[PDB]
From a paper:
We then generated Fab fragments of the lead clones and determined the cryo-EM structures of Clone 2 or 6 Fabs in complex with the ectodomain of SARS-CoV-2 spike trimer (S trimer) at ~3 Å resolution. Clone 2 Fab binds to S trimer in two states, one with 2 RBDs in the up conformation (60% of all complexes) and one with all 3 RBDs up (40%). Between the two clones, the Fab-RBD interfaces are different, although the two Fab clones bind RBD in similar locations with RBD adopting virtually the same conformation (RMSD 0.46 Å). Clone 2 Fab-S trimer complexes appear more flexible than Clone 6 complexes, as indicated by less well-defined cryo-EM density in the Clone 2 Fab-RBD regions. Clone 6 Fab shields the entire top surface of spike RBD (both “left shoulders” and “right ridge”), whereas Clone 2 Fab has a relative rotation of ~17° pivoted on the RBD right ridge, resulting in a larger contact area there and less contact with the RBD left shoulder. The three CDRH loops of Clone 2 Fab form a large positively charged paratope, complementing a negatively charged epitope contributed by the right ridge of spike RBD. In addition, in all complexes with two up/one down-RBDs and the Clone 6 Fab complex with two down/one up-RBDs, a down-RBD-binding Fab contacts the side surface of an adjacent up-RBD through another conserved interface mainly involving the CDRL1 loop of the Fabs, further stabilizing the conformation of the adjacent up-RBDs. When overlaying a Clone 2 Fab-bound down-RBD onto a Clone 6 Fab-bound down-RBD in the S trimer with more than one RBDs down, spatial clashes are detected between the Clone 2 Fab and the neighboring down RBD. This also explains why we did not observe Clone 2 Fab-bound S trimer in a conformation state with more than one RBD down. In contrast, due to the different binding conformations of Clone 2 Fab on spike RBD, the spike trimer has been detected in skewed states that favorite RBDs up, which mimics the effect of ACE2 binding during the conformational cycle of the spike trimer.
Author numbering:
A (entry chain F): 21 to 132, 163 to 179, 184 to 263
B (entry chain B): 348 to 595
C (entry chain G): 22 to 132, 160 to 263
D (entry chain C): 15 to 70, 75 to 110, 116 to 146, 152 to 298
The structure:
């Protein structure tokens, strides 16, 4: 059995777009196609429960709200229409059979008042002084993620690409650094390639002291 | 057959030999109750009921009239006053494929443990009480039987093996079946105490020219005394003449 | 029901057993049977289930995992902890309507304690031209998670203007890589000169200072 | 099932049993002796209920649910294979059916339908079974035997006599059989014949009712609904009830019973 789930969302606060979970080999008659929430932290909780055969739904009383859980068995898919939203309610929603022995790939629900913004590439110069470290800083892009490479991928050893972080500007940022012996600083070439397809931005930056 | 859908066979109306089962070394895990092990051929029973199921090693003690486990209480519950008795045989190699196999299923979830000698095949998924699933698998509502993975390399008593349980239940009707018994050679010209198919007495058992009907098995003389009897092993009629007792 | 789970981060070596526990608000023994649920999630993977109910286990789940409990007290047991047994493990409830999971129960591969090497990146003049300046205080591999990074800007405490980034331990070195970033405006950063980061960790008897000046 | 409804009444009559209905009380062999034995026997010159099956109109079968009344002497007289079997039990359950492929003695708790019959279809093969509605335990016995019965219509004046004694002693349903070629026209012949025992059938259910089990003739020349395909083969049978009596049985040289005398009957036999 395979689960298909769609998809990447850029919904703004106050709206609600129905998320699809195509069932494929599911029997769609005896496995409650349950829905749960995974955030960019651990913070798991169960969103709701549905009956594909019956049609009634049981939902958590804490946030009953206006979540619309429908057993659209004609397409054999469930649909998250969680009406009324806020910037806080921005997390991945997972659909899974029964208890969750087989889940779905998940959809990125990004409820933000902001919009798409192109990334900015900053040079972090090598240390003045022995292994010196240099790199690049990707700042102020939306939405996550950004693909970063070194020398178009030619530099792999000693490269650290830390995960993105959210700031108060409504955008994202991360760093890509490398540690090398200072003998490289004289001659060796380091260029970072930064790609953000949602903004279609590709920037190549030379890092040199 | 699987443990929950345990297969029942009625071997009544037929003479079965119980000694061969004892002499089998493979059927080593022989733990049964009630009738003495030597007394199987000695007694007669109305019915001969056979139940069959594969289970893991640790479940040998679990399934018994005295001891009842969750799998034992539900899937197949032996009577507390168990007149028949159980045979257990280790068949790890034949049952278990490499790295385990998945062909047998055990059922363990239900509100009520089954009464003794009860078979339940229903796949209706238990709703875990108040919460109604109405036939959909969920956190509370789960499938009654879970897949059984078995391999000898597994832990404490997980080795798969077959179990056959013999139940007699001779109380209701005349005992139609009996164990093999009382086979002895024949001697003709000598005063001997004979028992030819229940006919008790002493005498000289000679060959006889006069013959019974194919219907008739015994024969009496005038004044209602036994005169000839047909030999049950080989169908011929031997006359009887009691050995001399004249005075001196 | 609110389920809070005790120790939320245990370190496990290969083949070593450990217990991470879950305490609920009340007894889950409704209907005469407990209804807790136990889930494992590898980083970036669909979290599979480990138990049908209080005691049973899903098919396809190796028997090396186990656990049980009663009332408001449940726990796990995995004698053969392998490399794959490194994930986030949550516990749920199914008696009362608000079915809720737990927090975090991070398992990490056990090794000897390694001190965290500390490095500092000052923002460049090219970055300073743009209108922002980020100081990057980064740690070069260390096993124990608990570490503290504190800023001193001409020996001044800083808070409310920083962002930290955490990476999972690699399966071979079993050492965390951590980073932190102090973001200021160009004027705010260039107003002061001495910028340093202090790292306090259990593998270091004393905190380590990495410092820089403008120029 | 199929309530066959073409009966034309004509209530059954009574005929003389003459000197028929004597079996072998036991497996004992004797020779040229006269033995006085007390057992259940049909008294000599007793009234036996003459049941018919004819379609010539006047179409009528005879298959009621008669009481057992302590043993039953049944006797079918056929030119073809008409009467199939018998049903016993208290509430209706022994099922001795000569099913034209197999003699099945399924002893069960099944509750079948009214007017038990099978019916055969004329392309002269069988049609169906239409009895044994339930299955239930079917515990006691299920013995059968591959047999071939030529279910056809053979015009004549019957030359078969399947004499049968059915009784239940010590839980064993003893069936005594005897077959004899007698032409006659429609009546029960004279001449003594000893019903040698056939089977014993260890059972546990005591019988209080007796039912005869017939077969219908679905044909091409009178087909249609349930009441159309009758074509009743001209046959009959006789039923009497056993009574505790002391008889005098005379054995021959080779052990077969040749004559018998009812002790009570007339003073001469006393
Ligand atoms: C008991 O067994 C013997 C043999 O196993 C059966 O008698 C044999 O009959 C065949 C042919 O009739 C002869 O060629 C053999 O010589 C016989 N054997 C002996 C030992 O005499 C006999 O029929 C069996 N009894 C039964 C079946 O009631
Ligand atoms: C044949 O006719 C009889 C009587 O006209 C009916 O038999 C009834 O069958 C039902 C079965 O549900 C019983 O509940 C009744 O008690 C029966 N009644 C009698 C009087 O026997 C029925 O119409 C036909 N029998 C069938 C179809 O089996
Ligand atoms: C007598 O006739 C049939 C003819 O086939 C016998 O055969 C049984 O047929 C049923 C279904 O066709 C099978 O389930 C049994 O296993 C067959 N039995 C045997 C011994 O082969 C059957 O015994 C009798 N059927 C009836 C209705 O009396
Ligand atoms: C009892 O046994 C048989 C039964 O038929 C009779 O013996 C027959 O005798 C005649 C004449 O001698 C032969 O033609 C037959 O072949 C014999 N039959 C058999 C089966 O051997 C015998 O006479 C009978 N005893 C009587 C009538 O008193
Ligand atoms: C018994 O049979 C005789 C002879 O046919 C008859 O006269 C008599 O009425 C019968 N008894 C009945 C019908 O009760
Ligand atoms: C088996 O026998 C019992 C008791 O005689 C009866 O209750 C049960 O209904 C029988 N089985 C079937 C399938 O009828
Ligand atoms: C006949 O059978 C019934 C039920 O088995 C039993 O109650 C009754 O006593 C029996 N009658 C006898 C054996 O005379």
């Amino acid at each position: 059995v395979q689960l298909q789930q769609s998809g990447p969302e850029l919904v703004k606060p106050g709206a609600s777009v129905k998320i699809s979970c195509k069932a494929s080999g599911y029997s769609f008659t005896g496995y409650s196609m349950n829905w749960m929430k995974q955030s960019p932290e651990k913070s798991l909780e169960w969103i709701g429960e549905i009956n594909p055969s019956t049609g009634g739904t049981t939902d958590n009383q804490k946030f009953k709200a206006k979540a619309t859980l429908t057993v659209d068995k004609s397409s054999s898919t469930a649909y998250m229409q969680l009406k009324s939203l806020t910037s806080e309610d921005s997390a991945v929603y997972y659909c899974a059979r029964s208890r969750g022995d087989y889940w779905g790939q998940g959809t990125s629900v990004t409820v933000s008042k902001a919009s798409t913004k192109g990334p900015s590439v900053f040079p972090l110069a090598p240390s003045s002084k022995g292994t010196a470290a240099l790199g690049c800083l990707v700042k102020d892009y939306f939405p996550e993620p950004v693909t970063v490479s070194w020398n178009s991928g030619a530099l792999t050893s000693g490269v650290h690409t830390f995960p993105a972080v959210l700031q108060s500007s409504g955008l994202y940022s991360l760093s890509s650094v490398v540690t090398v012996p200072s003998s490289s600083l004289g001659t060796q070439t380091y260029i970072c390639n930064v790609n953000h397809k949602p903004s279609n931005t590709k920037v190549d930056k030379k890092v040199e002291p | 057959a699987s443990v929950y859908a345990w297969n029942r066979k009625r071997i009544s109306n037929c003479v079965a030999d119980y000694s061969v089962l004892y002499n089998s070394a493979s059927f080593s895990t022989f733990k049964c109750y009630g009738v003495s092990p030597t007394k199987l051929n000695d007694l007669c029973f109305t019915n001969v009921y056979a139940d069959s199921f594969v289970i893991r090693g640790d479940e040998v003690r679990q399934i018994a009239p005295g001891q009842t486990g969750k799998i034992a209480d539900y899937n197949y519950k032996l009577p507390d006053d168990f007149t028949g008795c159980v045979i257990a045989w280790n068949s790890n190699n034949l049952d278990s494929k490499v790295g385990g196999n998945y062909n047998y299923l055990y059922r363990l979830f239900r509100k009520s443990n089954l009464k003794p000698f009860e078979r339940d095949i229903s796949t209706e998924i238990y709703q875990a009480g108040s919460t109604p699933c109405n036939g959909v698998e969920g956190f509370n509502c789960y499938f009654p039987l879970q897949s059984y993975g078995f391999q000898p390399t597994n832990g404490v008593g997980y080795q798969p093996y077959r179990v056959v349980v013999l139940s007699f239940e001779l109380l209701h009707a005349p005992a139609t079946v009996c164990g093999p018994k009382k086979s002895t050679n024949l001697v003709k010209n000598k005063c001997v105490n004979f028992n030819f198919n229940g006919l008790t007495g002493t005498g000289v058992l000679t060959e006889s020219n006069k013959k019974f009907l194919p219907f008739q098995q015994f024969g009496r003389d005038i004044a209602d005394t036994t005169d000839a009897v047909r030999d049950p092993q080989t169908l011929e009629i031997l006359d009887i003449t009691p050995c001399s007792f004249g005075g001196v | 029901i609110v389920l809070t789970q005790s120790p939320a981060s245990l370190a496990v070596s290969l083949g070593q057993r450990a217990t991470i526990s879950c305490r609920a608000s009340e007894s889950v023994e409704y209907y005469g049977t407990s209804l807790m649920q136990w889930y494992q999630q590898k980083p970036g993977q669909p979290p599979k289930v480990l138990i049908y109910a209080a005691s049973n286990v899903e098919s396809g789940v190796p028997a090396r995992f186990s656990g049980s409990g009663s009332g408001t007290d449940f726990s796990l047991n995995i004698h053969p902890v392998e490399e794959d047994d490194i994930a986030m493990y949550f516990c749920q409830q199914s008696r009362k309507v608000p079915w809720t999971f737990g927090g975090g129960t991070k398992l990490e591969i056990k090794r000897t304690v390694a001190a965290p090497s500390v490095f500092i990146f000052p923002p460049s003049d090219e970055q300073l031209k743009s209108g922002t300046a980020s100081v990057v205080c980064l740690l070069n591999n260390f096993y124990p998670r608990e570490a503290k990074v504190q800023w001193k800007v001409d020996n001044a405490l800083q808070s409310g203007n920083s962002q930290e980034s955490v990476t999972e331990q690699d399966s071979k070195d079993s050492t965390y890589s951590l980073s932190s970033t102090l973001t200021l405006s160009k004027a705010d950063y260039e107003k002061h000169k001495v910028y340093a980061c202090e790292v306090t960790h259990q593998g270091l008897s004393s905190p380590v200072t990495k410092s820089f000046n403008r120029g | 099932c199929v309530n066959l409804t073409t009966r034309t009444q004509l209530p059954p009559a009574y005929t003389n049993s003459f000197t028929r209905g004597v079996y072998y009380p036991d497996k004992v062999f004797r020779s040229s002796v006269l033995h006085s034995t007390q057992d259940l026997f049909l008294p000599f010159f007793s009234n036996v209920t003459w049941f018919h099956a004819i379609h010539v109109g006047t179409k009528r079968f005879d298959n009621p649910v008669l009481p057992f009344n302590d043993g039953v002497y049944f006797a079918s007289t056929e030119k073809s294979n008409i009467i199939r079997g018998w049903i016993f039990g208290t509430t209706l359950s022994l099922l001795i059916v000569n099913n034209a492929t197999n003699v099945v003695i399924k002893v069960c708790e099944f509750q079948f339908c009214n007017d038990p019959f099978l019916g055969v279809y004329y392309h002269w093969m069988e049609s169906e079974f239409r009895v044994y509605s339930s299955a239930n335990n079917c515990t006691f016995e299920y013995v059968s035997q591959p047999f071939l019965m030529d279910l056809e219509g053979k015009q004549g004046n019957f030359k078969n006599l399947r004499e049968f004694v059915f009784k239940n002693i010590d839980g064993y349903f003893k069936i005594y059989s005897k077959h004899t070629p007698i032409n006659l026209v429609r009546d029960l012949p004279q001449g003594f014949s000893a019903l040698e025992p056939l089977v014993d059938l260890p059972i546990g259910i005591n019988i209080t009712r007796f039912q005869t089990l017939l077969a219908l003739h679905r044909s091409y020349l009178t087909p249609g609904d349930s009441s159309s395909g009758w074509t009743a083969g001209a046959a009959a049978y006789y039923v009497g009830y056993l009574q505790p009596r002391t008889f005098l049985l005379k054995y021959n040289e080779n052990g077969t019973i040749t004559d018998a005398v009812d002790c009570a009957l007339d003073p001469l036999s006393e």
